[PDB]
């Protein structure tokens, strides 16, 4: 009956709310800048995954309040309540449409090319032109040294890359002593080499001998599919209760 | 017949085990020097000998102190020189020095020293719990009559 | 029949609880995000609370939002049975938040009233072969060159006490971690004797316990005093609410 | 006789021919198949580069004593070959196990028995008292040729020699702006998300409007 209809509505609304919270939680998880990763993405204004997530925080709270609003309205059977409810959710719908699309648009560019550009250009530089260029040239260099010194990879494809392209490091450091970053030799616990001549030659397992693209892409790739598809599912759940609610609203006697 | 200096400016020279010593004066350079070290409680002298290095003024870092070690922990050691350049000779009077003892990581008795923050919080909040509980009880007691 | 002058008191008082409850919900999540990576540092000594306070408090803060919104509703609605359900929801959240306050603070002094309670871990687990020796050495070797410090007493902890390091590292070669030397952009040591003998400028001479203490201290007061601040507003509102329940 | 030197074996030297450097196998058994080992011996490496007049590269003088030529007087190996390194004759049975070079104790002596490196010493052009065989950084984009020679140290004559190597090319550089930082590709997800989430608003609008109309009707 109409009661059943109401039931369906309220149940979808409940789901809308629980999505608002779980979206808020997910957003906070990525907005945490969890292993940083600000430094690789503020380098190109490649920040829409985070921008979408921030949007995800406030729509997440917003959707929760609107949900209960909806229940309250349905129950109260008040035309104006429903109306306002409609408007508000419409707005919030737009903002999460925006977040979804902005994360989704960004991630296709995360590539073994992009991260190989920033590494050849911005690592170990010592001649940047301007302040915010020096502020980017620090954070990239630091992030490459975290990954190389503890997570034991080297380059984006591998310890090839430093030996096939021009780079910031290369103009500072001659290959005969610095054939790729020192951060790529395997050091013993004295934090000095197993044997350096063998790391110069590339004798296998004296050096970090794998690219890092997986480490860089893996989190970004999760953040990407994460906010966008979860927002889309909410934007469907909301769409069919919007149609139902609207219907009911329309069927209100005066 | 000089007096040794003390390079405690640039560095920390006291330690567990090893300690640092000033080189002989530039008057002696190219000379043959014997450093001698003596654990205070005993007659026990030990000799270590070297040529007096060229006077690199104040150019920073080499063994520019001499370094002395097997100076087993807690021990007071005196340090001294005898040196020669030609058949002429040179000397100094002893100076005492002392090396740190050992201390156990498991002998860290918990230095637990409460702040007033903890204790003020506990008292204040236990009082507040008490007042609310009591209040709630007394409220429903009064309401029971109406 | 209950004065509007007291209705307004419940309104403003609930609004204040609502806002500070939402802000506490936000703050306590921000503790659990572990802005300094100290969740590994507690868990080797165990019996933890500095995070358990926050993991109590997140739900308590959102609890304060929901019962307070309802509380504004109940005050305007002036319904006896609604004001009862304001008391008999709030006073449970109240008791849980007391525990959040007490727990969060109590462990703080149990470990950062003196640095040595933390120092015990570093002497045990630094570069030590056992499972948690590697885990916590990832925390430390990151703190070290993220912030330039050699220990809680810098390049002297490593000779002020026995540590796992001595037994692998004959001190005549390194009296302190090799990562205490300042490293170039090529990650090489700046001078050898300049760190093996140690002038006061090639060494990271600062005391590392500042960061550890300031982290622990800052996480704590965020839970503990913001908690008491909510609770000290709740008492007069909840007492006024007794008078509402007993007047209606 | 195909007495030819070689680029050091690509099984275990993954980066070898860097912008200024090359590792070579040493002359293992190479002078000694007919049992030449009868006293002390040393070997010279000479380096040279392709040019028309370079066929006058008489690595020995006419009286069979080697050229005393260096990177300066040859302008990096253009106007003649230069004496880029030397070492003693290895007696063939030593056969470094390239597998076992993971014994960190032996690693350096295995490399020092197995190979020689060309390009290594960026300092040695400068110092006015380093009166040594300078092994400077080799120039980029240059195919080199290499030649080991044996010298009878008891009498001071070249005994015999290798043929020049097949041309060895340095690594050479793409300029870093050439790396097209576009993907060309589109994901899959972007296209569904853009197309559906652009569609959805219109329908909501439609429905809302319809709601309006319905409520106005009744
Ligand atoms: C890369 O290029 C660099 C620079 O172009 C080369 O480095 C130099 O190598 C020379 C080799 O001749 C070094 O020469 C010095 O010779 C001194 C000779 O003096 C007397 O004393 C010795 C005993 O020590 C007697 O046998 C001799 O007959 C003389 O009476 C030595 O005393 C020097 O040793 C001291 O300096 C070195 C370098 O600091 C220390 O390692 C020693 O412990 C000692 O303190 C020295 O041998 C010259 O000093 C080097 N300079 C530099 C800048 O390193 C490399 O050889 C070259 N490498 C490669 C692989 O190509
Ligand atoms: C400085 O010069 C002196 C004088 O040469 C060196 O002292 C000692 O000199 C004596 C006599 O020349 C040497 O004596 C012999 O020593 C051996 C052990 O080395 C001993 O078995 C013999 O019975 C005999 O006594 C002695 O070698 C030498 N060294 C010492 C420590 O006694 C001194 O070594 C020179 N110091 C430097 C820095 O060169
Ligand atoms: C812990 O380390 C400090 C230095 O960081 C030690 O300080 C000593 O202080 C006295 C008095 O100021 C000096 O005479 C010593 O020279 C200092 N030691 C050094 C190495 O210079 C302190 O003794 C140590 N404490 C414990 C309990 O081990
Ligand atoms: C280097 O070549 C010389 C010349 O053949 C060799 O030395 C001569 O050997 C003959 C035959 O045994 C002797 O009659 C001569 O007296 C030797 N010359 C001298 C100066 O002693 C020499 O054996 C060869 N050395 C090597 C290392 O191959
Ligand atoms: C440093 O990076 C900037 C761009 O961020 C680049 O223009 C500059 O050429 C680099 N420095 C060197 C030494 O090439
Ligand atoms: C040693 O130091 C004392 C005190 O400063 C000084 O009086 C004396 O002249 C110095 N020289 C000698 C040989 O004692």
Residue numbers in the entry:
A (entry chain D): 7 to 260
B (entry chain B): 26 to 88, 102 to 184
C (entry chain A): 10 to 257
D (entry chain C): 19 to 236
Structure paper excerpt:
Our findings unveiled that the uroplakin complexes are situated within hexagonally arranged crystalline lipid membrane domains, rich in hexosylceramides. However, our high-resolution reconstruction revealed that Ia/II and Ib/IIIa heterodimers constitute the outer and inner subdomains, respectively. However, our findings suggest that the prosequence forms the external surface of the complex through the formation of several beta sheets. With these extracellular domains of UPII and UPIIIa, uroplakin heterotetramer overall adopts a Y-shaped conformation, which creates a substantial groove that may also provide a binding interface for other proteins (white arrow). Adjacent heterotetramers are connected through arches formed by the UPII and UPIIIa extracellular domains. The UPIIIa extends its loop 137–161 into the groove of an adjacent IIIa, forming an interface stabilized by a hydrophobic cluster composed of Pro146 of IIIa, Leu66, and Trp182 of the adjacent IIIa.
UPIa and UPIb have four transmembrane domains and belong to the tetraspanin family. The uroplakin complex also plays a crucial role in the development of urinary tract infections, as it facilitates Escherichia coli’s attachment to the urothelium.
